[PDB]
Amino acid sequence: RYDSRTTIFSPEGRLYQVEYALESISHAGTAIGIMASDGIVLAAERKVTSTLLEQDTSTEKLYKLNDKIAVAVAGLTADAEILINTARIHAQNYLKTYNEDIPVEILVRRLSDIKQGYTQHGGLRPFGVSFIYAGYDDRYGYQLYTSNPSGNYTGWKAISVGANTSAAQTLLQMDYKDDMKVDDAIELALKTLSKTTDSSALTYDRLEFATIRKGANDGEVYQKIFKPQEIKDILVKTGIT
Amino acid sequence: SEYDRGVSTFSPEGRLFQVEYSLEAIKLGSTAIGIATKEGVVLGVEKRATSPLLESDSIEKIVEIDRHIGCAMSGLTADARSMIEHARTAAVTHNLYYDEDINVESLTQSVCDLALRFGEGASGEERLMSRPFGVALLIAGHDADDGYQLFHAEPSGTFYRYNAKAIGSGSEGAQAELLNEWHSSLTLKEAELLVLKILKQVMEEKLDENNAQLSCITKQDGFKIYDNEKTAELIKELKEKEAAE
Amino acid sequence: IGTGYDLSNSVFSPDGRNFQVEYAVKAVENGTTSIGIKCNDGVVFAVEKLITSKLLVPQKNVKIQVVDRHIGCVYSGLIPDGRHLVNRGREEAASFKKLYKTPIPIPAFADRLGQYVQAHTLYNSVRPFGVSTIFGGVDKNGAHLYMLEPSGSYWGYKGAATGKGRQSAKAELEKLVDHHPEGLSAREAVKQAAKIIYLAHEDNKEKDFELEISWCSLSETNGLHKFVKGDLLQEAIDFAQKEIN
Amino acid sequence: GYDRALSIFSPDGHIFQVEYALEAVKRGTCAVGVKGKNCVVLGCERRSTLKLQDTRITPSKVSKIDSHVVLSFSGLNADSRILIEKARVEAQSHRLTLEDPVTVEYLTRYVAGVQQRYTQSGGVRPFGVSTLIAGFDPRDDEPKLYQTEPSGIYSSWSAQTIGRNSKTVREFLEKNYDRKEPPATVEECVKLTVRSLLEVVQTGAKNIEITVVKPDSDIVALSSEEINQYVTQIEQEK
Amino acid sequence: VDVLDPALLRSGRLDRKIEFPLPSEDSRAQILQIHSRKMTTDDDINWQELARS
Amino acid sequence: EKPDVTYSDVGGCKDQIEKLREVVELPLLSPERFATLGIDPPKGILLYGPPGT
Amino acid sequence: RNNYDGDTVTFSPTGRLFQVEYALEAIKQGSVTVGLRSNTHAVLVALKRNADELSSYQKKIIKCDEHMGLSLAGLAPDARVLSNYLRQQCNYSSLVFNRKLAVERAGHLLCDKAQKNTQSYGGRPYGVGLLIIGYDKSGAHLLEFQPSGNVTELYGTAIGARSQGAKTYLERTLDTFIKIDGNPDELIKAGVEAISQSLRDESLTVDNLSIAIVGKDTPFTIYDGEAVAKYI
Ligand SMILES: Nc1ncnc2c1ncn2[C@@H]1O[C@H](COP(=O)(O)OP(=O)(O)OP(=O)(O)O)[C@@H](O)[C@H]1O
């Protein structure tokens, strides 16, 4: 085998390290980002739950990297940690330098470059983490992206990474309508998350949620994390609980 | 084997098989022929095309290192960009330092110094190139003091002066022909048709100016890389000569 | 054996040891008889330097080297490797003389040398030494002789011996303690060294030897290191010749 | 086994990494460059995967280095990314030093030089990308189309295909194209570039991407509607 | 030495275990000599010098 | 018996072919020289190699 | 095994290095040269090998300085790096101490240099012998450099291919050529006879002879062509 390092290729010119790093994302739970006309909703899944586990101090797969762009996380979390910080620091470096907030495409481009750079040179490991970037910039309004652990990005109107990628993708696109209401965006997220997930009863503590809107509080990109007691309500509207 | 996985590791023969192997890279690249005369050295080459869409008039394999020092090459061109780069710098830094023409021989050594570099470090020549060079040069020029000289700079070994040398793919059959057809009585015009005559023999292609390129070092004419018409004219004379015979 | 242990020199075996350091010692076995004879008013060094053929020049190559002007050293094993440890000793010795304005104590030298050897077992981009080094001199607190193993072990020695014929050499030293319970004068311990090395040459009998003897003695060399040569050395030769026959 | 480093050679003199890099190009979609008498059209296969995927926010296969140099690529998308920004800066640094618009020769030679530098090194791989660097200059009216290869070797060719199933597309282009007569008009340059691409797309007239570069710093990227008139024009003659 | 059967590895079936090494430097020169006394010898030959090789 | 093969039907006048001549022909013509030197004349040979040579 | 043959930092079980041993093999494959000396003169005579007869030879003598120089046997790249380091040392000595550094003192620095690449991980070992000559206040000297890096002071030596017949010649005539002092012709003469004996597949020509001589009244001078026409 030729999986000894990033430098070395197989006969066919593929690199196994990239391949393993894709597979790493799908051994941690489903993550779904939906863009809609009236907001972009992010929703993610808890791969951990113990009866004495707490998860009310923090979301372990959602970080705001700037006051206008936030990311949902899929992969190993230690690997995740390093990069979340690198991105958020780079964001504010842009803010310091230009006195305005970072455009989405630059932010994604920076992290895929860093991730590729670890493949291109040295001994350092590639870091298999897939971020779903949901942002607003005046270039293309709402923008939903994801980053590959292969170290490039693609724009989206919906994407799912994490566990059950095939399952999440067809289900989301079947009930996609070009428009989409932000309430329906929420309703859809919960429905696809139940089916994918092997915990029969999808409760609010198995859910992370944020909705991102400039259609609420106009002239201002406002990202808002839902609290448990709000998540608890919407489950009763979708009839899970 | 096992002695081609270390560059500081010798064979039970006392040799380096990493280096040995780089000789076969030199041989892999297409044939180059140089022939020194008492009037100038004529440097001819082979090129290859697979499509006519290849611009054959805007590719390099005879390169100008100075206006009186020229070179041919054979082997990997990835390695050659770097090799030719170093050697340009030396000629220029000599005129920087001195206001006088570099020596052909002296240039030959400097090139081989960059060739020596296989790893990192080493005193009196800090090594920055990480693998064996896969490129050789036929180095032809003129300093007054030693007239017109032809060397073959060998990254594996060190430099050997030649009075005529063929490298590349067609080297073994050429060398024998070049024994029987290097003289101390060669003229520059005759040398020109000689080079083409030897090239054709070992070229399994068609002789044309599109895959050939003559050039001379004549110290009174400067380094002149030839035109397509000019070389075409030499292809034409060659054919009338050998038709009569 | 394999699996580390003898392939790397910082990796330990289940035996709690390293087999490469045993191999470092084995190269000492292969090296030639060197003794140091501690005395109560000096120290004496003798060495057997074999003669390979008679084209060699007489008394012009040694293994006796000096540090400062009062510390003699001689190494057995691998010759060019043994030079470099003494050379490294000099650089260390020089630093002591700079900072403290005084010659080095022989127990100070023994500590610094043993750190240098021990370092070459902590890294794996390094090779160990493969030499023992008998050394010592006279200082403040008198004469001291130490001997350093390629192991990085040392202890004080009333007699030190290394090289191939050291079995004979160690027995003769112990006889020397018994016959003279002060270890004899430094003048006669030179002669005593010659009788040892000649018997040690019954283990090396196939070729010829050259006896080089040096000393450093409290009042017989006036606290300085010098080579033992001329009528002193001629004496040693003669005493030694007499006493084998 | 001699395909483990770029400091170990085979008895034939190859570094299989470069050879396996050329197979990597083939993973990335085709790109085709063809020059005319007063233009170069740099045309490429584009991918439309899903309704969710966009085009606005979803990378183009053409990136414009500057206003008088353009660049297409084929290979892995991540590798070309670092190379393009790197290429763009190099292109700027020309003007910074010299104060002149970037030469196309200068650009192909440095950019593959970055590739070359990596290949020369044994401790790091180079890129797995082959590019087309096409352009003009405000001084020179001669149209130029250059190539890079993953070895860090740059070559110049009148017309070339690289990328996915390039070889098959190549043979068709040889025949129609002549060094004695390239396409006279721009529209005709485009028709040939399209005829070549039809082959790789199978069907898909949103999947054929056309860009045109002419001298005096004219770069245009053609509307969807314009690309579509060619496809329909080529089917009536077909 | 690790193909020796356990039958004979028990005391009183072997008692002397006697090692033959690969001829050392001093040993090569002597072996070479006897081979050389089947054919003509000359003053040219120095076995010590062949043994080093 | 008596092949209809010579060193025209073999290409190359290889190194092995030059050492091959010495084994068969040379001590057959003259066993005198071998006797005097004090070597016992070559008569065994093993030709071996990859297939198709 | 020869699994200790994979490194330069790993001693074998018998306490050898295979790396230093293979380097001895490379001297043998290298071109023959003879050193010898007298109290007042020292000479290297070396066989100048061409790759063919369109090839105009190769210099086997590198001038180190005006009182030093070396010849080679084995690797040509290797002779080149250590010649650069050695030349720097001669310059250094002359710059800082106003002095022609003793041959033997010079030779301990080149010995270390070798052992640097023996100690370290990376660094190619050296697989060349150099015969060093010089003439200082302490007269002529002759050193034989090893690929180990050991230094041996002899009155006479030869290394390279077929060089053992030249050692048997010199041994016999050892005391003869030493006593000749103030006569370079004879010492020169001796080095020619030695290297006659070596020959196989070669005959001496004018341009196989390179004689390098330093002495009591002689600069380091390398003699070639019409000046070795009196000694062909
Ligand atoms: N030396 C040669 N001259 C001409 N042809 C040759 C030569 N060597 C091999 N060939 C061709 O190869 C054919 C088959 O190989 P051949 O019988 O010579 O080989 P081998 O290595 O002795 O074989 P095997 O493993 O079959 O015993 C011959 O019939 C002949 O045509």
mmCIF file of N, CA and C in Angstrom, chain B residues 2-3 7-16 105 109-110 113 116 118 120 122-125 127 155-165 175-176 178-179 182, chain G residues 2 5-8 19 22-23 25-26 29 49-60 75-78 80-81 84-85 88 113 117 122-127:
data_model
loop_
_atom_site.group_PDB
_atom_site.id
_atom_site.type_symbol
_atom_site.label_atom_id
_atom_site.label_comp_id
_atom_site.label_asym_id
_atom_site.label_seq_id
_atom_site.Cartn_x
_atom_site.Cartn_y
_atom_site.Cartn_z
ATOM 1 N N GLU B 2 18.929 -2.460 -3.332
ATOM 2 C CA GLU B 2 18.816 -1.940 -2.000
ATOM 3 C C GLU B 2 19.733 -0.692 -1.911
ATOM 4 N N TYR B 3 20.515 -0.435 -2.960
ATOM 5 C CA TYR B 3 21.525 0.611 -2.959
ATOM 6 C C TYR B 3 21.183 1.749 -3.804
ATOM 7 N N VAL B 7 21.350 7.555 -0.934
ATOM 8 C CA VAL B 7 22.102 8.571 -1.630
ATOM 9 C C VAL B 7 23.338 8.928 -0.915
ATOM 10 N N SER B 8 23.653 8.169 0.115
ATOM 11 C CA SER B 8 24.802 8.202 0.958
ATOM 12 C C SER B 8 25.099 6.766 1.253
ATOM 13 N N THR B 9 24.360 5.826 0.574
ATOM 14 C CA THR B 9 24.492 4.429 0.836
ATOM 15 C C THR B 9 25.210 3.870 -0.340
ATOM 16 N N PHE B 10 26.347 3.163 -0.234
ATOM 17 C CA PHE B 10 27.057 2.692 -1.430
ATOM 18 C C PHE B 10 26.718 1.247 -1.639
ATOM 19 N N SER B 11 26.927 0.750 -2.892
ATOM 20 C CA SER B 11 26.803 -0.621 -3.354
ATOM 21 C C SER B 11 28.003 -1.379 -2.938
ATOM 22 N N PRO B 12 28.055 -2.687 -3.032
ATOM 23 C CA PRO B 12 29.262 -3.442 -2.662
ATOM 24 C C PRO B 12 30.385 -3.388 -3.664
ATOM 25 N N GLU B 13 30.133 -2.574 -4.745
ATOM 26 C CA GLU B 13 31.010 -2.118 -5.762
ATOM 27 C C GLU B 13 31.605 -0.752 -5.360
ATOM 28 N N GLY B 14 31.087 0.000 -4.387
ATOM 29 C CA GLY B 14 31.718 1.270 -3.963
ATOM 30 C C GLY B 14 30.963 2.422 -4.665
ATOM 31 N N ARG B 15 29.778 2.092 -5.328
ATOM 32 C CA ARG B 15 29.146 3.094 -6.179
ATOM 33 C C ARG B 15 27.853 3.459 -5.644
ATOM 34 N N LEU B 16 27.303 4.515 -6.217
ATOM 35 C CA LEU B 16 25.975 5.025 -6.029
ATOM 36 C C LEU B 16 25.170 4.787 -7.245
ATOM 37 N N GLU B 105 36.071 26.119 -19.928
ATOM 38 C CA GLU B 105 36.391 25.114 -18.937
ATOM 39 C C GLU B 105 35.841 25.509 -17.551
ATOM 40 N N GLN B 109 33.124 23.576 -14.853
ATOM 41 C CA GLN B 109 33.271 23.196 -13.487
ATOM 42 C C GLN B 109 32.104 23.672 -12.660
ATOM 43 N N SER B 110 31.637 24.978 -12.822
ATOM 44 C CA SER B 110 30.675 25.589 -11.973
ATOM 45 C C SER B 110 29.380 24.883 -12.030
ATOM 46 N N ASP B 113 29.346 21.810 -10.107
ATOM 47 C CA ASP B 113 29.287 22.082 -8.690
ATOM 48 C C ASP B 113 27.856 22.005 -8.179
ATOM 49 N N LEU B 116 26.780 18.426 -8.134
ATOM 50 C CA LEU B 116 27.272 17.676 -6.958
ATOM 51 C C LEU B 116 26.202 17.593 -5.868
ATOM 52 N N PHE B 118 23.147 16.778 -3.892
ATOM 53 C CA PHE B 118 22.232 15.652 -3.943
ATOM 54 C C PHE B 118 21.420 15.659 -2.649
ATOM 55 N N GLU B 120 21.570 17.961 1.369
ATOM 56 C CA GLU B 120 21.702 19.229 1.931
ATOM 57 C C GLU B 120 23.031 19.286 2.685
ATOM 58 N N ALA B 122 27.050 20.156 3.583
ATOM 59 C CA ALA B 122 28.359 19.931 3.022
ATOM 60 C C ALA B 122 29.104 21.170 3.013
ATOM 61 N N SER B 123 30.386 21.176 3.453
ATOM 62 C CA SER B 123 31.162 22.438 3.477
ATOM 63 C C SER B 123 31.619 22.792 2.105
ATOM 64 N N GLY B 124 31.827 24.123 1.921
ATOM 65 C CA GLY B 124 32.367 24.779 0.756
ATOM 66 C C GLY B 124 31.480 24.648 -0.442
ATOM 67 N N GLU B 125 30.249 24.284 -0.242
ATOM 68 C CA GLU B 125 29.302 24.279 -1.267
ATOM 69 C C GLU B 125 28.149 23.812 -0.478
ATOM 70 N N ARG B 127 24.523 22.854 -0.207
ATOM 71 C CA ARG B 127 23.717 22.025 -1.047
ATOM 72 C C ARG B 127 22.269 22.350 -0.857
ATOM 73 N N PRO B 155 26.841 15.176 -14.599
ATOM 74 C CA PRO B 155 26.492 15.466 -13.240
ATOM 75 C C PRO B 155 26.978 14.359 -12.324
ATOM 76 N N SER B 156 26.942 13.055 -12.788
ATOM 77 C CA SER B 156 27.284 11.780 -12.111
ATOM 78 C C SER B 156 28.756 11.794 -11.815
ATOM 79 N N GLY B 157 29.539 12.039 -12.905
ATOM 80 C CA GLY B 157 30.953 12.130 -12.740
ATOM 81 C C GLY B 157 31.260 13.539 -12.601
ATOM 82 N N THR B 158 32.277 13.970 -13.340
ATOM 83 C CA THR B 158 32.719 15.294 -13.551
ATOM 84 C C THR B 158 33.037 15.356 -15.016
ATOM 85 N N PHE B 159 33.447 16.628 -15.381
ATOM 86 C CA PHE B 159 33.579 16.994 -16.772
ATOM 87 C C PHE B 159 34.620 16.295 -17.524
ATOM 88 N N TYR B 160 34.408 15.883 -18.790
ATOM 89 C CA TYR B 160 35.376 15.307 -19.638
ATOM 90 C C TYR B 160 35.411 16.138 -20.873
ATOM 91 N N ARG B 161 36.557 16.631 -21.381
ATOM 92 C CA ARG B 161 36.768 17.325 -22.658
ATOM 93 C C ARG B 161 36.735 16.307 -23.748
ATOM 94 N N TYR B 162 36.129 16.720 -24.882
ATOM 95 C CA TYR B 162 35.889 15.888 -26.004
ATOM 96 C C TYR B 162 36.348 16.706 -27.104
ATOM 97 N N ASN B 163 36.648 16.115 -28.266
ATOM 98 C CA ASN B 163 36.897 16.834 -29.522
ATOM 99 C C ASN B 163 35.716 16.642 -30.407
ATOM 100 N N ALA B 164 34.782 15.787 -29.976
ATOM 101 C CA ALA B 164 33.511 15.542 -30.608
ATOM 102 C C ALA B 164 32.788 14.576 -29.655
ATOM 103 N N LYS B 165 31.473 14.763 -29.438
ATOM 104 C CA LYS B 165 30.769 14.005 -28.450
ATOM 105 C C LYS B 165 29.327 13.921 -28.952
ATOM 106 N N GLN B 175 29.138 7.509 -31.696
ATOM 107 C CA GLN B 175 30.502 7.629 -31.134
ATOM 108 C C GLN B 175 31.577 6.973 -32.022
ATOM 109 N N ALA B 176 31.224 5.815 -32.497
ATOM 110 C CA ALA B 176 31.959 5.018 -33.512
ATOM 111 C C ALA B 176 31.971 5.745 -34.752
ATOM 112 N N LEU B 178 31.759 8.984 -35.274
ATOM 113 C CA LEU B 178 32.482 10.174 -34.849
ATOM 114 C C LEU B 178 33.948 9.839 -34.622
ATOM 115 N N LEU B 179 34.332 8.563 -34.482
ATOM 116 C CA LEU B 179 35.722 8.236 -34.411
ATOM 117 C C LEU B 179 36.315 8.303 -35.828
ATOM 118 N N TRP B 182 35.800 12.234 -37.075
ATOM 119 C CA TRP B 182 36.372 13.417 -36.470
ATOM 120 C C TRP B 182 37.774 13.405 -37.012
ATOM 121 N N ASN G 2 24.875 -7.263 7.160
ATOM 122 C CA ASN G 2 24.224 -6.650 5.995
ATOM 123 C C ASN G 2 22.740 -6.546 6.301
ATOM 124 N N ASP G 5 24.232 -2.325 6.704
ATOM 125 C CA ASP G 5 24.711 -1.756 5.456
ATOM 126 C C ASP G 5 23.719 -0.669 5.036
ATOM 127 N N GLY G 6 22.578 -0.513 5.761
ATOM 128 C CA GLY G 6 21.486 0.474 5.472
ATOM 129 C C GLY G 6 21.794 1.830 6.097
ATOM 130 N N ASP G 7 22.855 2.134 6.820
ATOM 131 C CA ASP G 7 23.063 3.325 7.603
ATOM 132 C C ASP G 7 24.556 3.590 7.584
ATOM 133 N N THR G 8 24.916 4.760 8.138
ATOM 134 C CA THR G 8 26.263 5.219 8.314
ATOM 135 C C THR G 8 26.431 5.462 9.786
ATOM 136 N N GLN G 19 30.148 0.646 5.119
ATOM 137 C CA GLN G 19 30.180 1.865 4.304
ATOM 138 C C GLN G 19 31.546 2.294 3.937
ATOM 139 N N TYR G 22 33.060 -0.584 1.536
ATOM 140 C CA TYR G 22 32.678 -0.464 0.132
ATOM 141 C C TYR G 22 33.412 0.657 -0.549
ATOM 142 N N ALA G 23 33.733 1.695 0.249
ATOM 143 C CA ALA G 23 34.536 2.773 -0.185
ATOM 144 C C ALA G 23 35.931 2.396 -0.528
ATOM 145 N N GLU G 25 36.571 -0.409 -1.944
ATOM 146 C CA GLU G 25 36.371 -1.084 -3.246
ATOM 147 C C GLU G 25 36.409 -0.076 -4.425
ATOM 148 N N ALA G 26 35.969 1.183 -4.019
ATOM 149 C CA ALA G 26 35.878 2.243 -4.995
ATOM 150 C C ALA G 26 37.282 2.743 -5.364
ATOM 151 N N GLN G 29 38.562 0.459 -7.944
ATOM 152 C CA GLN G 29 38.022 0.674 -9.223
ATOM 153 C C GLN G 29 38.522 1.923 -9.866
ATOM 154 N N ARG G 49 43.594 8.773 -17.394
ATOM 155 C CA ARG G 49 42.600 7.961 -18.062
ATOM 156 C C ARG G 49 41.676 8.822 -18.691
ATOM 157 N N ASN G 50 41.321 8.383 -19.968
ATOM 158 C CA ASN G 50 40.410 9.017 -20.864
ATOM 159 C C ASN G 50 39.227 8.091 -20.859
ATOM 160 N N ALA G 51 38.008 8.492 -21.335
ATOM 161 C CA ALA G 51 36.903 7.546 -21.471
ATOM 162 C C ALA G 51 36.903 6.890 -22.786
ATOM 163 N N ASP G 52 37.656 7.418 -23.775
ATOM 164 C CA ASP G 52 37.768 6.978 -25.196
ATOM 165 C C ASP G 52 38.790 7.901 -25.832
ATOM 166 N N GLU G 53 38.844 7.866 -27.176
ATOM 167 C CA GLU G 53 40.001 8.513 -27.837
ATOM 168 C C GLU G 53 39.512 9.779 -28.524
ATOM 169 N N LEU G 54 38.244 10.110 -28.352
ATOM 170 C CA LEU G 54 37.638 11.398 -28.677
ATOM 171 C C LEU G 54 37.644 12.099 -27.389
ATOM 172 N N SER G 55 38.022 11.428 -26.287
ATOM 173 C CA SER G 55 38.066 12.083 -25.011
ATOM 174 C C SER G 55 39.470 12.448 -24.754
ATOM 175 N N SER G 56 39.672 13.701 -24.382
ATOM 176 C CA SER G 56 40.971 14.273 -24.085
ATOM 177 C C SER G 56 41.172 14.246 -22.585
ATOM 178 N N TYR G 57 41.133 13.037 -21.948
ATOM 179 C CA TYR G 57 41.695 12.789 -20.672
ATOM 180 C C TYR G 57 41.053 13.531 -19.568
ATOM 181 N N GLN G 58 41.615 13.347 -18.349
ATOM 182 C CA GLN G 58 41.144 13.852 -17.207
ATOM 183 C C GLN G 58 42.319 14.067 -16.289
ATOM 184 N N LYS G 59 42.355 15.261 -15.609
ATOM 185 C CA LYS G 59 43.344 15.558 -14.622
ATOM 186 C C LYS G 59 43.174 14.832 -13.375
ATOM 187 N N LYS G 60 44.196 14.096 -12.947
ATOM 188 C CA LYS G 60 44.114 13.303 -11.767
ATOM 189 C C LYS G 60 44.891 14.043 -10.642
ATOM 190 N N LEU G 75 36.497 8.185 -6.477
ATOM 191 C CA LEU G 75 35.509 9.162 -6.827
ATOM 192 C C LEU G 75 36.044 10.472 -7.132
ATOM 193 N N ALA G 76 35.678 11.012 -8.337
ATOM 194 C CA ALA G 76 35.950 12.379 -8.769
ATOM 195 C C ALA G 76 35.105 13.492 -8.091
ATOM 196 N N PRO G 77 33.789 13.486 -7.834
ATOM 197 C CA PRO G 77 33.007 14.399 -7.041
ATOM 198 C C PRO G 77 33.562 14.473 -5.643
ATOM 199 N N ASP G 78 33.967 13.332 -5.051
ATOM 200 C CA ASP G 78 34.452 13.294 -3.714
ATOM 201 C C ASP G 78 35.757 13.948 -3.528
ATOM 202 N N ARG G 80 36.876 16.437 -5.442
ATOM 203 C CA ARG G 80 36.507 17.823 -5.561
ATOM 204 C C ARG G 80 36.020 18.570 -4.311
ATOM 205 N N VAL G 81 35.156 18.015 -3.487
ATOM 206 C CA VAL G 81 34.683 18.690 -2.272
ATOM 207 C C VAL G 81 35.857 18.794 -1.273
ATOM 208 N N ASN G 84 38.380 21.417 -2.069
ATOM 209 C CA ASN G 84 37.927 22.751 -1.776
ATOM 210 C C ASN G 84 38.167 23.018 -0.327
ATOM 211 N N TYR G 85 37.818 22.025 0.517
ATOM 212 C CA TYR G 85 38.009 22.223 1.943
ATOM 213 C C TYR G 85 39.474 22.316 2.369
ATOM 214 N N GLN G 88 41.040 25.961 1.221
ATOM 215 C CA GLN G 88 40.591 26.910 2.202
ATOM 216 C C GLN G 88 41.454 26.884 3.402
ATOM 217 N N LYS G 113 37.019 15.762 8.604
ATOM 218 C CA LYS G 113 36.068 16.168 7.684
ATOM 219 C C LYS G 113 35.292 14.976 7.137
ATOM 220 N N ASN G 117 30.971 12.915 8.172
ATOM 221 C CA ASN G 117 29.950 12.347 7.330
ATOM 222 C C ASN G 117 29.728 10.942 7.694
ATOM 223 N N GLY G 122 22.700 11.274 7.051
ATOM 224 C CA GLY G 122 22.973 11.971 5.773
ATOM 225 C C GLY G 122 24.424 12.293 5.779
ATOM 226 N N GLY G 123 24.894 12.859 4.599
ATOM 227 C CA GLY G 123 26.243 13.208 4.376
ATOM 228 C C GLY G 123 26.741 11.984 3.719
ATOM 229 N N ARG G 124 27.294 12.054 2.502
ATOM 230 C CA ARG G 124 27.726 10.840 1.813
ATOM 231 C C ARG G 124 29.046 10.575 2.353
ATOM 232 N N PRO G 125 29.365 9.339 2.708
ATOM 233 C CA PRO G 125 30.763 9.106 2.971
ATOM 234 C C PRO G 125 31.726 9.412 1.756
ATOM 235 N N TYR G 126 33.057 9.208 1.970
ATOM 236 C CA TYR G 126 33.967 9.535 0.908
ATOM 237 C C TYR G 126 34.583 8.250 0.606
ATOM 238 N N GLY G 127 34.780 7.953 -0.713
ATOM 239 C CA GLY G 127 35.225 6.721 -1.273
ATOM 240 C C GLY G 127 36.263 6.933 -2.216
#
